[PDB]
Amino acid sequence: IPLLLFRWKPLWGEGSLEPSPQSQAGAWKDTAQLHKSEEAVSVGQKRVLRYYLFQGQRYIWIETQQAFYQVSLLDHGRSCDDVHRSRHGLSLQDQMVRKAIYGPNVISIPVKSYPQLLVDEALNPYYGFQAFSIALWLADHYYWYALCIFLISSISICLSLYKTRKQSQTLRDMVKLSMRVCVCRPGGEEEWVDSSELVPGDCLVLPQEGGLMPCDAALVAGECMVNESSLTGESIPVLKTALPEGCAETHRRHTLFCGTLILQARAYVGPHVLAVVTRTGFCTAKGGLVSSILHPRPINFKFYKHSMKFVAALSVLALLGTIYSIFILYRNRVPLNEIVIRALDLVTVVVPPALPAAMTVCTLYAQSRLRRQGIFCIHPLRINLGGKLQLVCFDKTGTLTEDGLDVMGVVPLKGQAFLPLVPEPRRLPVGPLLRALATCHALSRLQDTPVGDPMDLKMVESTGPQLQVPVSVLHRFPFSSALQRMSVVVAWPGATQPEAYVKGSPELVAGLCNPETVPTDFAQMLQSYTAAGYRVVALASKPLPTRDTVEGDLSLLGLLVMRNLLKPQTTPVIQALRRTRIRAVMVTGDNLQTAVTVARGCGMVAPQEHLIIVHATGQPASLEFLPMESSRHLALSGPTFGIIVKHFPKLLPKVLVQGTVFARMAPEQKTELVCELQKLQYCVGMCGDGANDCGALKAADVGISLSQAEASVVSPFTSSMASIECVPMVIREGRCSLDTSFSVFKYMALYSLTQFISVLILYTINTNLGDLQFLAIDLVITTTVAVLMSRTGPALVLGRVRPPGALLSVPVLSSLLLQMVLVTGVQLGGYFLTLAQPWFVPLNRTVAAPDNLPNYENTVVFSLSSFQYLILAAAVSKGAPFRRPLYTNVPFLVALALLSSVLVGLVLVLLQGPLALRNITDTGFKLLLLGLVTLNFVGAFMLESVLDQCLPACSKKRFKQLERELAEQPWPP
């Protein structure tokens, strides 16, 4: 083999592909087009048996003849007749043959124990640089400073251990489905096998009492009632029917997904129900969503996008900083054994150890602020995407309107008089119409919940009679979608003859009713509700003294009115997004005439703002642009949106920039409306609720789901308040986390730089900063005010000003430099003020640098510098546009106050044996050392309250450029 390139590697992956060449040359090699590293095979079970798991799917492909990839969907072209032939169980000898091809039917999480996980964190070139720094400063004997950068790099690791062991504990909780499952064998058995031995091609008999689900099986025989709350959040009971003979992604009403909980499971044909296993652990629903979490898409928040700028600047400060060290120390007559070490020591102060510890902890407080409010996020780095959102798409029903249809009242008809809509249906007396709305229902009085059609259960408590004077006699015609109506014959004690109640649409039923009974103003009465967003149904009766005699020659009695109201917290939120100039889009799959009358109510289309319906044609002709008379908006449609994206590709960005109401959108069309806005360089958000949004919540940059405790059908922000008032809370938290991450970074840099400058102003005169001084500084002062810096919080009102989004920009480099100038003109303003004192004596220069110098040239530099760090933390931590004022952070004022008081003490009145300061500065020189700290405290607040008020006189996003064109000339004629 001669593969021992390991010996070569001992000497030491930026270029893995390059590295790969070294390792090897029809086995164990796989370049999977993304980092190209997945080497696995098993070759067991007396076959070829390719094995490799690339993200958890098995890919049985070692060749082209007797192998084929994608264990998911390798038997996807089945027929509906074929699964009925699999009603019998697989053979027990053949049952342990399909387990080789498929998985063990367990979506598994590795344990990743503590020796295996500490090695995956410390193996990086930014903890190995500091392990070099442990053995670098410890060449100067028995340092305390070589202990602190071990003790604050054991906080940097242990916080990265905590955010990993708590994220993987969350994913391991939701996929725990330990249950013993009864099946059928090849010939008349049960055998009660474990759920970790189920393969597709097996039967499955459901328990009628209780149990969740083993795996997504097709309901081949029987009736079942499930609870889909684990997979979609729509927690209403869904009735599952038996699969007819003659497509698993199409027949949703015949599949029992893995994770949903089954409730009734009645048989009605035989002794029990039957199912046919289709998928397994990593290739199911709830197995595909978890595999989309633990291998996420890369986030489009390029934090430190420049990637070379900081590194090259680092290079210049380090080198043009370390060649000043080699120029001044060599003019101090050194024996060359330590110049090298002094320079490496100068390079180790420009890399702060607590930089990964303060950027990690800045995100743990962000998840700790959203969990108090309700939003449960799991991907920690997608918090910062909420600060950068120019666009938010909404669903309609359940999201910013009510969940189900709600009744308004009754419009009766007593002799064609058109008596108006009553506000409360509990107020009309009992008759043929009041008995009508309480008995024509396809519900079921089972387990104390009326379960059935969501519409007619709402009119049960609209008046509230008793249920289970009328009695359920017979359902003469079931409510079918083909004939659209439902006839129920009812009787009651005290009747001469039973009546026949039937409900349906207004137009189709009145065309079958008596023409002498339906009036002439029936079309405009239908028109006055179908154009305002009302859903209206009619009802009829006929007394009976079978066939369709129950539905014929009917009297028109009255109208029933249903209407989806807005939520009370919808209107102040849509106005608060329009006021802060982020654009609001509604993406619904409901009717178009309903969607316009809602988008005028909530506030996408404000009054005195025109909108025009496009309504393109299926033919390749023009767009027709119908107007509406009741900025500039456009209202699209479902089949309209397919015409522009196919036949008019040059006119597509002119529509998505100024189109607001998208109606009749298919659930597979909600996902490329998001992927097309991301190609206009929007950063799209998506608040949604249901199964229709499962493709579009993932594709969005911030996908938010409503009204669920802790689920995974979201991208990540499942919240739990059932309103759209959480979508400003993600904007308002993602903005106070995007500049806090900037304020933490531009403080670490400011500290490293003040230290490089105090070790460099002390390398001249050969008076290097002490032992407990480096420790003090770092640990105490710079880690207390960096772990506690990021606890402030979000503001209370959003604003028009976005965060700057780019770290190394022109307002950041300038402040750092000006602040550095104020910092170096005060250490030089403190060093050259002791030198003019009468009590001043110099240092014994020719002894060593760290050995025997408790002198006056470090006492002034350590005192001035300690305060510089505390001043700078407070200066860089501002919260006027985005975060909050810093006095609300009570554990951050107590740091500053306590640390400042200790520091003022060690300069006025000890820690003089320790920290090696000069014994007593005798005269009243102490009182004006606090003088030029005060004009550093004043001179830093009055420097960043001026520099952020700077406008340099001298549309990056694609959409912004288009908007400018629209402003100059409206695109519609």
Numbering used by the authors: 60 to 71, 113 to 125, 140 to 360, 365 to 582, 610 to 613, 620 to 696, 708 to 779, 784 to 796, ...
Authors' text:
The structure of the human ATP13A2 adopts the typical P-type ATPase fold with overall dimensions of 125 Å × 75 Å × 70 Å, including ten transmembrane (TM) helices and three conserved cytoplasmic domains [N (nucleotide-binding) domain; A (actuator) domain; and P (phosphorylation) domain].
To investigate the conformational change of ATP13A2 during the phosphorylation process, we solved two intermediate state structures, a 3.3 Å resolution E1 state and a 3.0 Å E1P-ADP state. Both of these two maps show well-resolved density. Notably, in our E1 state and E1P-ADP state structures, this cavity is nearly closed which prevents the binding and passage of substrate. The binding of ATP and Mg2+ induces the proximal arrangement of the N domain, by which the N domain tilt around 30° to lay close to the A and P domain, resulting in the E1-to-(E1-ATP) transition. Release of the Pi forms the intermediate E2 state, in which the cavity towards cytosol is open, thus allowing the translocation of SPM to the cytosol side.
